[PDB]
Amino acid sequence: ILSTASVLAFERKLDPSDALMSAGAWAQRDASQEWPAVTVREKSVQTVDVANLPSDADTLKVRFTLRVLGGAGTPSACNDAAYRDKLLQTVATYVNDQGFAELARRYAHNLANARFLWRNRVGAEAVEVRINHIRQGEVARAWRFDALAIGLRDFKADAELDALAELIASGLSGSGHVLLEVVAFARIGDGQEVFPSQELKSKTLYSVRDAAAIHSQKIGNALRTIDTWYPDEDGLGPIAVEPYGSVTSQGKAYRQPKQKLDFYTLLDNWVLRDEAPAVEQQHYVIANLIRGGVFGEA
Amino acid sequence: MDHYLDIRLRPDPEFPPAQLMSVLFGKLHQALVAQGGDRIGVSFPDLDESRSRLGERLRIHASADDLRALLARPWLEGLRDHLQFGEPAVVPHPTPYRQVSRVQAKSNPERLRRRLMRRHDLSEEEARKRIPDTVARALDLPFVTLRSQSTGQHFRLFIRHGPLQVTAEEGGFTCYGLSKGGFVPWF
């Protein structure tokens, strides 16, 4: 029969740390070690929470660590062992078809452009991303990208980029452990208001310990924005890899289930009836398996 | 004033287009502060008056050299992903002209009360009896929201397009692209 398992929990791959922010000056980012972090402040307008840079700063210092785990096709809790074996065979067949080539390149793009800087990148005239490869506590290999050249819409190539792509692909395959400290540097302006992820004093801004921060799941949703294989209209760029391709800004869901392009129909075509989809659709399927989920029937 | 440039906000899965309009308006305000001049117009081509919606495009009316200096200004960095634009082409000839105005409001009675402390030195109860709480103005016009480097408070800038006349009038433009007496073509 080979039905879908009743429980199909998948862990998140590419675990993001809780991204802080901090303030400082451009051309002092080489000495960006003891930079003072911005703080959530209550201001009476009714009182609301605001976060902004001080007077003697124009650059943000969003820092988070990303861990590439591997074993993307392996579920954490699968009800059926035959379905788990068939799905592992299908994911391994995908790996022999391509060894996490395009997915790691697009994830290296979402690292390379500061899409994790959601609203801290729109008003910035100079955005910079620094990625250190921490291995046994030391910087194995450093990278210093530029989000101005690497656009948020097109999907290009660059040599250090491909180096980051092979590193993320080796992490996703399982041939090693990849831990990347990513520090952003956006010239948002002198004392301009920044946008941390907001907690729910009508509205509060989330922090960790005397220092404002961005949520991990915001960084994860920014990293998942590789999906361009949806039936795109009206000139929309990449969307986040979600089940049934939904975006909150447009209020609509691409990859509609009335079409045969949502993630679950592509899974049941790929691993149950052996109807292998296109290369782009299986790229999207493996990206959704990388992000994790609670997949399964009821 | 003869040339126009249409900047259309490319849709974003992260932001509704109102914040893109606000960011573009602040960036063009900074560009107009840095450049100087008052022959630079601002319009809204798909301005629907049904729900006071701004639309999804923006129109800039200026000369050839002024628009060339505007594109040569580095204000456009960081906005190429969210916006797309053509070239500073000329406007069509049979185009009726309308004006654009910034209509502010006295939405805070307490601000005017604090003003009247600084002009007549009256008491708080004299301010409350002279100015009640019903003096707040509700304005049903399209608007963008902005913050300033000089004044850190977040302010709303209402934009209103005037009646469609038949000719243009010689007038200047503000740093926001709004008219202090100027006119822009409509097409």
Swiss-Prot record, chain B:
<keyword id="KW-0051">Antiviral defense</keyword>
<dbReference type="GO" id="GO:0051607">
    <property type="term" value="P:defense response to virus"/>
</dbReference>
<keyword id="KW-0255">Endonuclease</keyword>
<dbReference type="GO" id="GO:0003723">
    <property type="term" value="F:RNA binding"/>
</dbReference>
<comment type="subunit">
    <text>Part of the Csy ribonucleoprotein complex with a probable stoichiometry of Csy1(1),Csy2(1),Csy3(6),Cas6/Csy4(1)-crRNA(1). A Csy3(6),Cas6/Csy4(1)-crRNA(1) subcomplex is also formed.</text>
</comment>
<keyword id="KW-0378">Hydrolase</keyword>
<feature type="site" description="Substrate binding">
    <location>
        <position position="148"/>
    </location>
</feature>
<protein>
    <recommendedName>
        <fullName>CRISPR-associated endonuclease Cas6/Csy4</fullName>
        <ecNumber>3.1.-.-</ecNumber>
    </recommendedName>
</protein>
<dbReference type="InterPro" id="IPR013396">
    <property type="entry name" value="CRISPR-assoc_prot_Csy4"/>
</dbReference>
<dbReference type="GO" id="GO:0004519">
    <property type="term" value="F:endonuclease activity"/>
</dbReference>
<keyword id="KW-0540">Nuclease</keyword>
<comment type="similarity">
    <text>Belongs to the CRISPR-associated endoribonuclease Cas6 family. Cas6f/Csy4, subtype I-F/Ypest subfamily.</text>
</comment>
<comment type="function">
    <text>CRISPR (clustered regularly interspaced short palindromic repeat) is an adaptive immune system that provides protection against mobile genetic elements (viruses, transposable elements and conjugative plasmids). CRISPR clusters contain sequences complementary to antecedent mobile elements and target invading nucleic acids. CRISPR clusters are transcribed and processed into CRISPR RNA (crRNA). Processes pre-crRNA into individual crRNA units. Absolutely required for crRNA production or stability.</text>
</comment>
<dbReference type="Pfam" id="PF09618">
    <property type="entry name" value="Cas_Csy4"/>
</dbReference>
<dbReference type="GO" id="GO:0043571">
    <property type="term" value="P:maintenance of CRISPR repeat elements"/>
</dbReference>
<dbReference type="InterPro" id="IPR042564">
    <property type="entry name" value="CRISPR-Cas6/Csy4_sf"/>
</dbReference>
<keyword id="KW-0694">RNA-binding</keyword>
<feature type="active site" description="Proton acceptor">
    <location>
        <position position="29"/>
    </location>
</feature>
